[PDB]
Amino acid sequence: ESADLRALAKHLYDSYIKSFPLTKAKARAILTGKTSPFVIYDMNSLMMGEDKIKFKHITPKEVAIRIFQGCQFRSVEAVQEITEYAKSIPGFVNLDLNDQVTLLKYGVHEIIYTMLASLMNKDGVLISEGQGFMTREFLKSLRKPFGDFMEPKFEFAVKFNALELDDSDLAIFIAVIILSGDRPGLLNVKPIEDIQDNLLQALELQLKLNHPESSQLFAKLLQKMTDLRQIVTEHVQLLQVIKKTETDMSLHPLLQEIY
Amino acid sequence: QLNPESADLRALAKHLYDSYIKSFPLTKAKARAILTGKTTDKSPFVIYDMNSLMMGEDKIKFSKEVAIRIFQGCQFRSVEAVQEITEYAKSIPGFVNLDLNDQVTLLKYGVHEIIYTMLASLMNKDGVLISEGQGFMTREFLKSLRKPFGDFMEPKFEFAVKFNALELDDSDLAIFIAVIILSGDRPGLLNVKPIEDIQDNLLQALELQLKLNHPESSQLFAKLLQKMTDLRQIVTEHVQLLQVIKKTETDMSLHPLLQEIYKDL
Ligand SMILES: CCCOc1ccc(C[C@@H](Cc2ccccc2)C(=O)O)cc1CNC(=O)c1ccc(N2CCCCC2)cc1
């Protein structure tokens, strides 16, 4: 029965490679130098960044605000990649359509930040297909409340990254996050937990075969789930604060609809 | 079931379960026995309203304001729970050998998550055993308490009903709360290495324990670990729900120990 576990792993991996253009293996090569990305470390470099390379996340205003909005544009984009990926998880599409919607609704944020760590090191984050590298300090230098917008993700990133997981490990971890039976509103919890259970086994073997020397990596990874939700909860808090305050956030009526 | 390594992990499970029974007067096995009302001597007095509360003062061993009285009651029992857990902690191989500051940090962030883990052993969907099992206060009575007290316990009942679904027994919990205490990612830890080394070992013990005790319960280990996020959540809500209390109830004192644990949490 350990055959069906390997098949599911490879399947998730293959699908993950197809759904996500910028993998961790690739991002890592770019980040460590052993491949170069345009570097954004201040206003002028940001400015030139937009002119030189056409960062779609920066279209036609305070910089802190356009950077924040760019983050949302990219997030929206990411949500589609994740949604497509989810469909390849054996059993997902056979679930009640409302539950599928529910799972993605509460799961994409956790996945977003999980995958974002793949593009981050203690010094910055890769943006627009890795074409650029936005400095951690520059982001942390934005005026309140934008300055501490990304920092919480960086702190998580540093920790998550010390586990040294690779694309094949993440593919399965990602699927496990999606099949969470404790999401509010689910109408049929059983099949969801039964699939996650099949995914957890697959993940456990993967980690043991891929990291035989890393003791209890499975437990440690599952524990990171706590850090993820705290990151999402906290993110949701700041998001409303920016909405309750900030008067220069309004976008075209249709754009606001899109997000 | 074979190798010397497994043997070492079973020895650890036994040591931890033994210390657990020695440190906690009311185990889950005892709590369940009282709750399933099977016996004729373990019968608890049920408080489900004012007149009952009124009569419980005479029945069970055990400020004139219903809501606050019950609240001061939980605080005292909570302070006492901190003492039992602190005593259990000392028995965890390696804990007393860590830097003293880290010992404090680990207890500071770990006692509440553990308090609520264990509190579930005393709960079922209708209420919670109190005063060493002599009494039983229903969920509805608690929920009918003046605001903002009327909903301080509800989220703990919700957690308990789900967590109890795992059907863990005391021997499993002893290792699980040990794992909770030895968390290397607690804010402010000085030496994270020695703590992780200890937790990894405890995690191996827990993993084997759950496999030998619940062979038919697939992935119980992972499911139990994911529960640690429900605990964090329960603690956070509580802390915030508490800050609201002291602002509307300037006349309600919070015990110093609890206040120190929550401070800069
Ligand atoms: C009946 C529901 C209460 O159950 C909880 C709930 C929470 C906690 C721990 C809390 C305590 C707390 C709450 C608010 C601010 C600081 C501390 C915690 O986690 O700190 C124990 C307990 C355990 N409580 C008891 O055993 C208990 C004991 C006595 C009591 N009574 C008040 C005195 C007269 C008789 C009735 C009520 C309850």
From Swiss-Prot, chain B:
Name the GO cellular-component terms. chromatin; cytosol; intracellular membrane-bounded organelle; nucleoplasm; nucleus; receptor complex; RNA polymerase II transcription regulator complex
GO molecular function of the protein, one example?
sequence-specific DNA binding
Q: Where is rosiglitazone bound in this sequence?
A: 75-78, 112, 238, 262
Protein name, per record:
Peroxisome proliferator-activated receptor gamma
- Major site of localization recorded for this protein: nucleus
Q: Where is this cross-link: Glycyl lysine isopeptide (Lys-Gly) (interchain with G-Cter in ubiquitin)?
A: 22
How activity is controlled: the entry says:
PDPK1 activates its transcriptional activity independently of its kinase activity.
Q: What is known of its domains?
A: The 9aaTAD motif is a transactivation domain present in a large number of yeast and animal transcription factors.
Q: Which UniProt keywords apply?
A: Activator, Biological rhythms, Cytoplasm, Diabetes mellitus, Disease variant, DNA-binding, Glycoprotein, Isopeptide bond, Metal-binding, Nucleus, Obesity, Phosphoprotein, Receptor, Transcription, Transcription regulation, Ubl conjugation, Zinc, Zinc-finger
Source species of the chain: Homo sapiens
Full protein: residues contained: 231 to 504 of 505
General function of this protein: Nuclear receptor that binds peroxisome proliferators such as hypolipidemic drugs and fatty acids. Once activated by a ligand, the nuclear receptor binds to DNA specific PPAR response elements (PPRE) and modulates the transcription of its target genes, such as acyl-CoA oxidase. It therefore controls the peroxisomal beta-oxidation pathway of fatty acids. Key regulator of adipocyte differentiation and glucose homeostasis. ARF6 acts as a key regulator of the tissue-specific adipocyte P2 (aP2) enhancer. (Microbial infection) Upon treatment with M.tuberculosis or its lipoprotein LpqH, phosphorylation of MAPK p38 and IL-6 production are modulated, probably via this protein.
The Swiss-Prot or TrEMBL record describes its family as follows: Belongs to the nuclear hormone receptor family. NR1 subfamily.
Q: Where in the cell is it found?
A: Nucleus; Cytoplasm
Q: How does it assemble?
A: Interacts with FOXO1 (acetylated form). Heterodimer with other nuclear receptors, such as RXRA. The heterodimer with the retinoic acid receptor RXRA is called adipocyte-specific transcription factor ARF6. Interacts with NCOA6 coactivator, leading to a strong increase in transcription of target genes. Interacts with coactivator PPARBP, leading to a mild increase in transcription of target genes. Interacts with NOCA7 in a ligand-inducible manner. Interacts with NCOA1 and NCOA2 LXXLL motifs. Interacts with ASXL1, ASXL2, DNTTIP2, FAM120B, MAP2K1/MEK1, NR0B2, PDPK1, PRDM16, PRMT2 and TGFB1I1.
Q: Where is the NR LBD domain?
A: 8-264
* Source species, domain of life: Eukaryota
Copy out the induction comment: (Microbial infection) Expression increases when incubated with M.tuberculosis or its lipoprotein LpqH; induction is TLR2-dependent (at protein level).
One Gene Ontology BP term is: negative regulation of inflammatory response
Q: Where is this motif: 9aaTAD?
A: 256-264
Upper classification of the source organism reads: Eukaryota, Metazoa, Chordata, Craniata, Vertebrata
From the UniProt entry, list the residue stretches annotated as the region Interaction with FAM120B.
1-50
